[PDB]
Every structure is written in structure tokens, then in C-alpha cells.
């Protein structure tokens, strides 16, 4: 038992981190097979990336893997990411995929500086397409990932910090999550919402862990609960969310719409001093999959 | 900016994790040089000396992935079994075995069948238990800290107590607290909030621009400790004040000045406000955790 903000083990990603330098700019790169991926702003107010890239040559990119220098034999741009072909395939390349995640999904971040790891943490892609990360200057090129049975699915690459302290980035194909751009223009995160299906998943995790003070004898309907969710800035609950919660409702014997009646009471009345898994706020950064994995040992 | 529950990168520890089987029990072992360390209760199903004397090297099946490591010797040190193997771990990091004090945090690499599954951060509570997240089969999973390239192993998982919290040993097999590896009725004593860690996290909040809770008054250790006792917080000592010195210098806020701000939070509550997104005071970030995360300390 117990329930924590658990990230995936980072070792498979640590073996892929390199330092990429172009002129006075230094950031991180991800080295998979014979290619190094990094934010294209490593070569750059009003940039003409295509003209900047044609002006640069292979020798203008300094790639360092620990103490070894990688010879760059090619270079191309894919959206907001720069791909540097190197003369050696990474002997530590794990099984990997590049995936674009949807809002509400969680992933681990290996924060890096100068191609070296600082730490790992778990975060979620918010409904407004930002992440509440922990990044400082030089963390660009740090990636977010999920691990499924030895295969690393890379989903995020860090590019920037927005005015409110939240972060923006791209998938490993260079496509920004949300409306953000890699230019020094005005851009801010939109209004965010709470991920309802994750709050319910975490309520089931609390029940599995013995916290049942918030349970009640009542059951609501999807339509009635969604009216409550809109008032509290919670994402609408769909029948697909109810279905995905299936293993947790089966394990605890509590229907999803029975748990929704507990959530409605918690939204309207609070906790009156009590806590749920050590928290006085409703937590929305654990998916239903994260909960079955951590609480029941699914995939372990 | 941002402040997350951040674990150390786990790559150096994943390279040491192996599967240890004795009869019908499978658990995790830590492989350093030509020795595998694991909980001695792997030999059970209770006189441990007699259970070990009856065992032979062939009764221990050790696997590093799908590769078997032949056991060529065995011995018991306190509550850990040391299995000498025919292969030295070529991924053995620079390491130390350290026994930590209550309040200290560490990263746990949760493992099942010798396979790393998750990483999270937790603390040695003042009652010598850890509020971890472990399931059946997680025994032999370790807790650690890293400094430069040296891994200090501080915890090996052995058991879960009635309240869902956990108990284990250092890597020399000595239990933290008054717990034993027997099937007896053991219980965690009353816990206390780690004051020095709460102060550290308030400095983390200040570094991140959260400063509504600051006041310009100062207090004394004696006056602060009267309030601490009332709210089940550990007394603050001159050692804790000295340990907060660097964070005090970084923010320009004296330790006793921050104590007067914590005193007001304890007596008045947060009144609907949050600090680093939390409605409760967090006590599982040490002063050093704040320095590492806010300055971007990396590991080699
Ligand atoms: C990047 O520097 C993070 C802060 C952005 C603020 C922009 C001006 C309001
Ligand atoms: C180990 O078996 C964890 C559960 C212990 C509870 C004993 C009964 C209170």
C-alpha cells in the first residue's frame, strides 16, 4: 500500500542525453540511433529558421556525450526540432517510440542541464496544453516520457517558460503542444480546467488505500454530475472515462457514478479538516492507468 | 521556475537491480561488485541462522535481466543476506552505505522481479517509518541519495506495517526504528512534522515568488518551539538553523524571521490560500533538496 507521485525509472533516458552547442547557446539533446534531437532555437525576436539553418554547417554543431565528442555528418529541421545525424549509433538506445499525448495524460520528465541529469518527476499535460514543470535556464531539450515494458515512448521536449511559471514544449516531431511558438512574441497559457477522470482515479486509489471517509450511499447520473463539473471548472465526464475507470470500480465495488456523488459532495462542502492520501486539495495528475499500476501492480 | 517532488535520476541504481529467488519466494537484490544484498526473509517458508545453515549456494537463483549470476558464497549480516556471485557488476557506481537520520529524504527505486518499475521521493519519518508506495514483491527495493557520481544507499525495503507505512533496514541489515523481520504485532509510534523541512519548503516558495506568508517580525527558538510542540512539530535546534543558513543567505530572510512566518501559519492557517500549489505545509523536502532543485545540480 501507499500512494506517491511516482515517475518511471529514468535510466533508459539518461543513456540518451547529450549536450548540444551552437555558438553561444547550449542545451540538451536526445540521442537515439545515429540521430540527435534538440530544440531548433539552438541555432537562433523574428527568426528565419530555414535561412539560419542553410547558413549553418555540420561542423557548427558541437555534440558531447559525457566525455566523447560526436561527429555530426548531417542536419535537418522537422518543425521546431533539429535533427543532427551523427557518425555513431547510440549503443544505449532503448526500444523507443515518438508519441503525441492528449490533455489529461501523465508522463515523467528527466530534467537535464549540459546533457547531465538533475532529477526526475511526474507531471501531466494540462487541458490548456502546458505542463506545471520544474525547469531552469538551460533545461531545453529535456524530455518527457512513459515506459511500457522496456519501450520508451517520448512525448515531450522542453522549449520554454510562460509568464505564469508553467512550461511549453513540443512532441519529438517538433510540433508544439498548444498554440505556442518558438519566437520572442507575447504568449500566455489559456484558462485551465481540472481533469475529472484523474480526480476520480485518485479517489479510487484513496479507497484502495483505506481512505473511505468521503464515500456516501448515493449514486448520481452522468448528466447530473456533468452539470456540477461545469460549475466547478472540471472537464466533462464521458462514457469512455467511465469505461476506463472499469478496473477500479470493479476492484472496490464502487460504481463510477457512486464515486461521482462523493466527488460532488467534496466539491460543494470540502473536507472539514480531513485529508485524502495526505492531500487537502483534489489531485488530478494521476490517470486511471497510473492508479491500477501503482495500487494493484498492473504491468509489474 | 516550478517546484516538484523530484527524485534523483535512477540510472545508476537500475544497473544494480537483480532478481533473487529462494524456493517459492522471489524478491529484489542490490548487485555491487561481486556481491548481491537482499532481505534475509527470502529464505523463509523463524530461526534465521538455522534456516541459512540448511541452505546452499545452489538454493539461490540470481538473475540480472535474463542472465543468471552463479552464487559462489553466502552469509548473513543482520537482516540482510550477502550472496557472493561469480560475476562483478560492470555497472557498479561509486557508492557508500549510509544510515540516515529522521527527517532526511531519499529516492526509492520500486522494483518487482528484479525489474525497476517506479521512482519516487520520500522521507525517514521521526517515528522511523517511511510513507512509501510498495506492493508484495517489492522487498529488496532500495532508497538512495546521489552526490556528484557517488550513490549513498540508505534503505532496503522489508515490510509493511498495519497503518500502510513501511519499515526496512540500512544496507548493513539494521532496521530503522524498533522493528523486526518476524510475524509479530508491530506498530508505528506517533509521528511528528519535520520542522526544518517545512522551513526549507517555505524558502523554496520564496525563491519561486510566493511570499504572501512572510512577515517582518522575528521570533526566538524558545518562543517558536512552544508553538511547534502544540502543533506536533519537531523542536527546531541551532543545528537546523545552521543547516538553513545557505537558503537564508540566498533569499535574504533570516532563519528566525522565517520561523515567525511559520508560527503565524500554524496559529492562523492558510485561510483558503496556497503555497507552491499546496493547502497544507510540506515536510518532505530537506534544505539540500531545495538547493539542488532551485539551482539545477546535476549528477555525473
Ligand atoms: C521566461 O523568461 C519566463 C518569464 C516570461 C515573462 C515574459 C514577460 C511578462
Ligand atoms: C502486512 O501483512 C501488512 C498488514 C499488517 C496488518 C495486520 C493487522 C492489523
GROMACS .gro file of N, CA, C and O in nm, chain B residues 9-101:
model
  372
  309UNK      N    1   1.796   1.101  -1.051
  309UNK     CA    2   1.790   1.009  -1.166
  309UNK      C    3   1.828   0.868  -1.116
  309UNK      O    4   1.916   0.855  -1.031
  310UNK      N    5   1.756   0.765  -1.160
  310UNK     CA    6   1.776   0.631  -1.104
  310UNK      C    7   1.863   0.535  -1.185
  310UNK      O    8   1.880   0.421  -1.142
  311UNK      N    9   1.916   0.579  -1.298
  311UNK     CA   10   2.001   0.501  -1.386
  311UNK      C   11   2.112   0.422  -1.317
  311UNK      O   12   2.128   0.303  -1.344
  312UNK      N   13   2.188   0.487  -1.228
  312UNK     CA   14   2.298   0.419  -1.158
  312UNK      C   15   2.249   0.306  -1.068
  312UNK      O   16   2.320   0.207  -1.051
  313UNK      N   17   2.128   0.320  -1.013
  313UNK     CA   18   2.070   0.217  -0.926
  313UNK      C   19   2.003   0.106  -1.006
  313UNK      O   20   2.015  -0.011  -0.969
  314UNK      N   21   1.936   0.140  -1.120
  314UNK     CA   22   1.875   0.039  -1.207
  314UNK      C   23   1.977  -0.062  -1.256
  314UNK      O   24   1.946  -0.179  -1.263
  315UNK      N   25   2.099  -0.016  -1.285
  315UNK     CA   26   2.208  -0.103  -1.329
  315UNK      C   27   2.257  -0.199  -1.220
  315UNK      O   28   2.343  -0.283  -1.246
  316UNK      N   29   2.206  -0.185  -1.097
  316UNK     CA   30   2.242  -0.274  -0.987
  316UNK      C   31   2.131  -0.369  -0.946
  316UNK      O   32   2.154  -0.451  -0.859
  317UNK      N   33   2.010  -0.355  -1.000
  317UNK     CA   34   1.897  -0.434  -0.959
  317UNK      C   35   1.894  -0.572  -1.022
  317UNK      O   36   1.910  -0.586  -1.142
  318UNK      N   37   1.881  -0.675  -0.939
  318UNK     CA   38   1.875  -0.814  -0.986
  318UNK      C   39   1.758  -0.885  -0.916
  318UNK      O   40   1.705  -0.835  -0.815
  319UNK      N   41   1.718  -0.999  -0.970
  319UNK     CA   42   1.613  -1.081  -0.914
  319UNK      C   43   1.678  -1.191  -0.829
  319UNK      O   44   1.775  -1.254  -0.871
  320UNK      N   45   1.627  -1.212  -0.709
  320UNK     CA   46   1.679  -1.313  -0.618
  320UNK      C   47   1.566  -1.406  -0.581
  320UNK      O   48   1.464  -1.361  -0.526
  321UNK      N   49   1.582  -1.536  -0.611
  321UNK     CA   50   1.481  -1.636  -0.580
  321UNK      C   51   1.540  -1.743  -0.489
  321UNK      O   52   1.650  -1.794  -0.512
  322UNK      N   53   1.466  -1.775  -0.382
  322UNK     CA   54   1.499  -1.884  -0.294
  322UNK      C   55   1.370  -1.961  -0.276
  322UNK      O   56   1.277  -1.911  -0.214
  323UNK      N   57   1.362  -2.078  -0.336
  323UNK     CA   58   1.243  -2.160  -0.329
  323UNK      C   59   1.126  -2.097  -0.400
  323UNK      O   60   1.135  -2.069  -0.520
  324UNK      N   61   1.017  -2.071  -0.327
  324UNK     CA   62   0.899  -2.010  -0.388
  324UNK      C   63   0.897  -1.856  -0.377
  324UNK      O   64   0.811  -1.792  -0.435
  325UNK      N   65   0.993  -1.796  -0.304
  325UNK     CA   66   0.997  -1.651  -0.286
  325UNK      C   67   1.090  -1.585  -0.385
  325UNK      O   68   1.206  -1.624  -0.396
  326UNK      N   69   1.039  -1.483  -0.455
  326UNK     CA   70   1.119  -1.402  -0.545
  326UNK      C   71   1.115  -1.259  -0.491
  326UNK      O   72   1.008  -1.207  -0.459
  327UNK      N   73   1.232  -1.197  -0.476
  327UNK     CA   74   1.240  -1.057  -0.436
  327UNK      C   75   1.357  -0.987  -0.511
  327UNK      O   76   1.412  -1.045  -0.606
  328UNK      N   77   1.392  -0.864  -0.473
  328UNK     CA   78   1.497  -0.790  -0.540
  328UNK      C   79   1.626  -0.792  -0.461
  328UNK      O   80   1.625  -0.799  -0.338
  329UNK      N   81   1.736  -0.785  -0.533
  329UNK     CA   82   1.868  -0.778  -0.474
  329UNK      C   83   1.947  -0.662  -0.532
  329UNK      O   84   1.923  -0.621  -0.645
  330UNK      N   85   2.043  -0.609  -0.454
  330UNK     CA   86   2.128  -0.499  -0.499
  330UNK      C   87   2.266  -0.557  -0.530
  330UNK      O   88   2.332  -0.610  -0.440
  331UNK      N   89   2.310  -0.548  -0.655
  331UNK     CA   90   2.435  -0.606  -0.703
  331UNK      C   91   2.546  -0.502  -0.719
  331UNK      O   92   2.540  -0.415  -0.808
  332UNK      N   93   2.645  -0.508  -0.630
  332UNK     CA   94   2.758  -0.414  -0.628
  332UNK      C   95   2.883  -0.496  -0.626
  332UNK      O   96   2.895  -0.585  -0.543
  333UNK      N   97   2.975  -0.473  -0.722
  333UNK     CA   98   3.097  -0.555  -0.734
  333UNK      C   99   3.054  -0.705  -0.750
  333UNK      O  100   2.963  -0.729  -0.829
  334UNK      N  101   3.109  -0.800  -0.675
  334UNK     CA  102   3.069  -0.940  -0.686
  334UNK      C  103   2.979  -0.985  -0.570
  334UNK      O  104   2.983  -1.101  -0.535
  335UNK      N  105   2.899  -0.893  -0.512
  335UNK     CA  106   2.807  -0.926  -0.402
  335UNK      C  107   2.664  -0.877  -0.429
  335UNK      O  108   2.642  -0.770  -0.485
  336UNK      N  109   2.566  -0.958  -0.391
  336UNK     CA  110   2.425  -0.925  -0.405
  336UNK      C  111   2.367  -0.915  -0.265
  336UNK      O  112   2.382  -1.008  -0.188
  337UNK      N  113   2.305  -0.802  -0.231
  337UNK     CA  114   2.248  -0.776  -0.098
  337UNK      C  115   2.099  -0.785  -0.110
  337UNK      O  116   2.041  -0.724  -0.198
  338UNK      N  117   2.035  -0.859  -0.021
  338UNK     CA  118   1.890  -0.874  -0.023
  338UNK      C  119   1.834  -0.902   0.116
  338UNK      O  120   1.910  -0.941   0.207
  339UNK      N  121   1.703  -0.884   0.138
  339UNK     CA  122   1.647  -0.912   0.271
  339UNK      C  123   1.659  -1.062   0.302
  339UNK      O  124   1.635  -1.145   0.215
  340UNK      N  125   1.704  -1.097   0.424
  340UNK     CA  126   1.723  -1.238   0.460
  340UNK      C  127   1.593  -1.316   0.464
  340UNK      O  128   1.598  -1.438   0.456
  341UNK      N  129   1.475  -1.248   0.473
  341UNK     CA  130   1.350  -1.323   0.480
  341UNK      C  131   1.317  -1.395   0.346
  341UNK      O  132   1.220  -1.469   0.343
  342UNK      N  133   1.402  -1.381   0.242
  342UNK     CA  134   1.389  -1.457   0.116
  342UNK      C  135   1.402  -1.609   0.145
  342UNK      O  136   1.344  -1.691   0.073
  343UNK      N  137   1.477  -1.647   0.251
  343UNK     CA  138   1.498  -1.787   0.287
  343UNK      C  139   1.383  -1.846   0.371
  343UNK      O  140   1.387  -1.964   0.401
  344UNK      N  141   1.281  -1.766   0.407
  344UNK     CA  142   1.170  -1.816   0.489
  344UNK      C  143   1.060  -1.890   0.412
  344UNK      O  144   1.042  -1.868   0.292
  345UNK      N  145   0.985  -1.975   0.485
  345UNK     CA  146   0.872  -2.057   0.442
  345UNK      C  147   0.901  -2.139   0.317
  345UNK      O  148   0.901  -2.261   0.327
  346UNK      N  149   1.108  -1.770   1.366
  346UNK     CA  150   1.177  -1.823   1.248
  346UNK      C  151   1.327  -1.804   1.261
  346UNK      O  152   1.377  -1.696   1.228
  347UNK      N  153   1.399  -1.906   1.311
  347UNK     CA  154   1.544  -1.903   1.332
  347UNK      C  155   1.620  -1.885   1.202
  347UNK      O  156   1.643  -1.982   1.131
  348UNK      N  157   1.664  -1.762   1.175
  348UNK     CA  158   1.737  -1.731   1.053
  348UNK      C  159   1.872  -1.799   1.042
  348UNK      O  160   1.906  -1.841   0.933
  349UNK      N  161   1.946  -1.813   1.152
  349UNK     CA  162   2.076  -1.882   1.149
  349UNK      C  163   2.059  -2.029   1.106
  349UNK      O  164   2.142  -2.081   1.031
  350UNK      N  165   1.955  -2.096   1.157
  350UNK     CA  166   1.931  -2.236   1.123
  350UNK      C  167   1.877  -2.249   0.981
  350UNK      O  168   1.910  -2.345   0.912
  351UNK      N  169   1.794  -2.153   0.937
  351UNK     CA  170   1.740  -2.154   0.801
  351UNK      C  171   1.855  -2.131   0.701
  351UNK      O  172   1.858  -2.197   0.599
  352UNK      N  173   1.952  -2.043   0.734
  352UNK     CA  174   2.065  -2.019   0.645
  352UNK      C  175   2.162  -2.137   0.641
  352UNK      O  176   2.209  -2.175   0.534
  353UNK      N  177   2.190  -2.199   0.758
  353UNK     CA  178   2.280  -2.314   0.764
  353UNK      C  179   2.234  -2.429   0.674
  353UNK      O  180   2.317  -2.498   0.615
  354UNK      N  181   2.102  -2.446   0.661
  354UNK     CA  182   2.046  -2.554   0.578
  354UNK      C  183   2.054  -2.523   0.429
  354UNK      O  184   2.046  -2.615   0.348
  355UNK      N  185   2.067  -2.394   0.391
  355UNK     CA  186   2.074  -2.353   0.252
  355UNK      C  187   2.214  -2.372   0.194
  355UNK      O  188   2.314  -2.371   0.266
  356UNK      N  189   2.221  -2.388   0.063
  356UNK     CA  190   2.346  -2.398  -0.010
  356UNK      C  191   2.346  -2.288  -0.119
  356UNK      O  192   2.241  -2.229  -0.148
  357UNK      N  193   2.461  -2.265  -0.185
  357UNK     CA  194   2.471  -2.168  -0.293
  357UNK      C  195   2.370  -2.194  -0.404
  357UNK      O  196   2.312  -2.099  -0.457
  358UNK      N  197   2.345  -2.323  -0.437
  358UNK     CA  198   2.250  -2.361  -0.543
  358UNK      C  199   2.104  -2.330  -0.508
  358UNK      O  200   2.021  -2.330  -0.598
  359UNK      N  201   2.071  -2.304  -0.381
  359UNK     CA  202   1.934  -2.267  -0.343
  359UNK      C  203   1.899  -2.122  -0.379
  359UNK      O  204   1.783  -2.083  -0.367
  360UNK      N  205   1.998  -2.042  -0.421
  360UNK     CA  206   1.979  -1.903  -0.458
  360UNK      C  207   1.993  -1.888  -0.609
  360UNK      O  208   2.096  -1.922  -0.667
  361UNK      N  209   1.887  -1.844  -0.675
  361UNK     CA  210   1.887  -1.822  -0.818
  361UNK      C  211   1.890  -1.672  -0.836
  361UNK      O  212   1.799  -1.603  -0.791
  362UNK      N  213   1.999  -1.620  -0.894
  362UNK     CA  214   2.013  -1.476  -0.913
  362UNK      C  215   2.013  -1.445  -1.062
  362UNK      O  216   2.083  -1.510  -1.139
  363UNK      N  217   1.931  -1.346  -1.103
  363UNK     CA  218   1.924  -1.309  -1.244
  363UNK      C  219   1.936  -1.159  -1.265
  363UNK      O  220   1.866  -1.081  -1.201
  364UNK      N  221   2.027  -1.120  -1.355
  364UNK     CA  222   2.047  -0.983  -1.399
  364UNK      C  223   1.981  -0.983  -1.536
  364UNK      O  224   2.040  -1.032  -1.633
  365UNK      N  225   1.856  -0.941  -1.542
  365UNK     CA  226   1.776  -0.949  -1.663
  365UNK      C  227   1.748  -1.096  -1.691
  365UNK      O  228   1.707  -1.170  -1.600
  366UNK      N  229   1.779  -1.143  -1.811
  366UNK     CA  230   1.766  -1.286  -1.844
  366UNK      C  231   1.897  -1.365  -1.821
  366UNK      O  232   1.903  -1.483  -1.851
  367UNK      N  233   2.002  -1.299  -1.769
  367UNK     CA  234   2.134  -1.356  -1.747
  367UNK      C  235   2.149  -1.405  -1.603
  367UNK      O  236   2.141  -1.325  -1.510
  368UNK      N  237   2.177  -1.534  -1.584
  368UNK     CA  238   2.196  -1.589  -1.450
  368UNK      C  239   2.334  -1.555  -1.393
  368UNK      O  240   2.433  -1.559  -1.465
  369UNK      N  241   2.341  -1.521  -1.264
  369UNK     CA  242   2.467  -1.496  -1.197
  369UNK      C  243   2.482  -1.612  -1.099
  369UNK      O  244   2.391  -1.633  -1.017
  370UNK      N  245   2.589  -1.690  -1.110
  370UNK     CA  246   2.605  -1.805  -1.022
  370UNK      C  247   2.649  -1.764  -0.883
  370UNK      O  248   2.745  -1.689  -0.870
  371UNK      N  249   2.579  -1.812  -0.780
  371UNK     CA  250   2.611  -1.781  -0.641
  371UNK      C  251   2.724  -1.872  -0.595
  371UNK      O  252   2.708  -1.993  -0.597
  372UNK      N  253   2.838  -1.814  -0.555
  372UNK     CA  254   2.953  -1.891  -0.508
  372UNK      C  255   2.982  -1.878  -0.358
  372UNK      O  256   3.077  -1.936  -0.308
  373UNK      N  257   2.898  -1.803  -0.286
  373UNK     CA  258   2.912  -1.788  -0.142
  373UNK      C  259   2.791  -1.718  -0.084
  373UNK      O  260   2.719  -1.648  -0.155
  374UNK      N  261   2.765  -1.738   0.045
  374UNK     CA  262   2.652  -1.672   0.109
  374UNK      C  263   2.680  -1.652   0.256
  374UNK      O  264   2.748  -1.732   0.317
  375UNK      N  265   2.628  -1.544   0.311
  375UNK     CA  266   2.641  -1.511   0.452
  375UNK      C  267   2.527  -1.415   0.491
  375UNK      O  268   2.463  -1.356   0.404
  376UNK      N  269   2.507  -1.394   0.619
  376UNK     CA  270   2.404  -1.306   0.669
  376UNK      C  271   2.468  -1.199   0.753
  376UNK      O  272   2.552  -1.228   0.837
  377UNK      N  273   2.427  -1.074   0.731
  377UNK     CA  274   2.474  -0.964   0.812
  377UNK      C  275   2.348  -0.898   0.861
  377UNK      O  276   2.272  -0.844   0.780
  378UNK      N  277   2.318  -0.911   0.989
  378UNK     CA  278   2.197  -0.856   1.047
  378UNK      C  279   2.072  -0.908   0.971
  378UNK      O  280   2.061  -1.028   0.955
  379UNK      N  281   1.985  -0.821   0.916
  379UNK     CA  282   1.868  -0.867   0.840
  379UNK      C  283   1.889  -0.871   0.689
  379UNK      O  284   1.791  -0.880   0.615
  380UNK      N  285   2.015  -0.866   0.643
  380UNK     CA  286   2.042  -0.881   0.500
  380UNK      C  287   2.129  -1.004   0.474
  380UNK      O  288   2.207  -1.049   0.558
  381UNK      N  289   2.107  -1.063   0.360
  381UNK     CA  290   2.179  -1.178   0.312
  381UNK      C  291   2.276  -1.125   0.204
  381UNK      O  292   2.238  -1.041   0.120
  382UNK      N  293   2.402  -1.161   0.213
  382UNK     CA  294   2.503  -1.122   0.116
  382UNK      C  295   2.537  -1.247   0.034
  382UNK      O  296   2.587  -1.347   0.087
  383UNK      N  297   2.506  -1.242  -0.094
  383UNK     CA  298   2.530  -1.352  -0.185
  383UNK      C  299   2.646  -1.320  -0.276
  383UNK      O  300   2.633  -1.234  -0.365
  384UNK      N  301   2.760  -1.389  -0.256
  384UNK     CA  302   2.876  -1.367  -0.340
  384UNK      C  303   2.847  -1.432  -0.474
  384UNK      O  304   2.801  -1.546  -0.477
  385UNK      N  305   2.867  -1.359  -0.583
  385UNK     CA  306   2.841  -1.411  -0.717
  385UNK      C  307   2.970  -1.421  -0.801
  385UNK      O  308   3.068  -1.352  -0.774
  386UNK      N  309   2.967  -1.507  -0.904
  386UNK     CA  310   3.083  -1.527  -0.992
  386UNK      C  311   3.109  -1.412  -1.089
  386UNK      O  312   3.211  -1.411  -1.156
  387UNK      N  313   3.018  -1.313  -1.097
  387UNK     CA  314   3.034  -1.201  -1.189
  387UNK      C  315   3.032  -1.068  -1.114
  387UNK      O  316   2.943  -1.045  -1.034
  388UNK      N  317   3.131  -0.982  -1.139
  388UNK     CA  318   3.132  -0.848  -1.080
  388UNK      C  319   3.044  -0.757  -1.167
  388UNK      O  320   3.044  -0.770  -1.290
  389UNK      N  321   2.963  -0.671  -1.106
  389UNK     CA  322   2.875  -0.581  -1.179
  389UNK      C  323   2.955  -0.475  -1.251
  389UNK      O  324   3.011  -0.388  -1.186
  390UNK      N  325   2.963  -0.479  -1.386
  390UNK     CA  326   3.041  -0.377  -1.459
  390UNK      C  327   2.978  -0.238  -1.457
  390UNK      O  328   3.040  -0.141  -1.498
  391UNK      N  329   2.855  -0.228  -1.407
  391UNK     CA  330   2.785  -0.102  -1.390
  391UNK      C  331   2.784  -0.058  -1.242
  391UNK      O  332   2.697   0.019  -1.204
  392UNK      N  333   2.877  -0.109  -1.157
  392UNK     CA  334   2.879  -0.068  -1.017
  392UNK      C  335   2.918   0.076  -1.008
  392UNK      O  336   3.026   0.114  -1.052
  393UNK      N  337   2.831   0.161  -0.952
  393UNK     CA  338   2.868   0.302  -0.938
  393UNK      C  339   2.964   0.320  -0.822
  393UNK      O  340   2.985   0.229  -0.740
  394UNK      N  341   3.015   0.442  -0.807
  394UNK     CA  342   3.087   0.482  -0.686
  394UNK      C  343   2.980   0.486  -0.577
  394UNK      O  344   2.870   0.535  -0.606
  395UNK      N  345   3.001   0.417  -0.463
  395UNK     CA  346   2.893   0.407  -0.365
  395UNK      C  347   2.940   0.406  -0.222
  395UNK      O  348   3.057   0.379  -0.193
  396UNK      N  349   2.846   0.434  -0.132
  396UNK     CA  350   2.862   0.427   0.013
  396UNK      C  351   2.731   0.372   0.069
  396UNK      O  352   2.623   0.389   0.009
  397UNK      N  353   2.739   0.308   0.184
  397UNK     CA  354   2.622   0.259   0.256
  397UNK      C  355   2.612   0.354   0.372
  397UNK      O  356   2.708   0.366   0.449
  398UNK      N  357   2.503   0.428   0.382
  398UNK     CA  358   2.488   0.530   0.485
  398UNK      C  359   2.361   0.506   0.566
  398UNK      O  360   2.260   0.461   0.510
  399UNK      N  361   2.366   0.529   0.697
  399UNK     CA  362   2.248   0.516   0.780
  399UNK      C  363   2.195   0.656   0.802
  399UNK      O  364   2.264   0.736   0.866
  400UNK      N  365   2.077   0.690   0.749
  400UNK     CA  366   2.024   0.826   0.763
  400UNK      C  367   1.951   0.852   0.896
  400UNK      O  368   1.914   0.759   0.969
  401UNK      N  369   1.930   0.980   0.927
  401UNK     CA  370   1.861   1.028   1.045
  401UNK      C  371   1.717   1.062   1.008
  401UNK      O  372   1.691   1.101   0.894
   0.00000   0.00000   0.00000
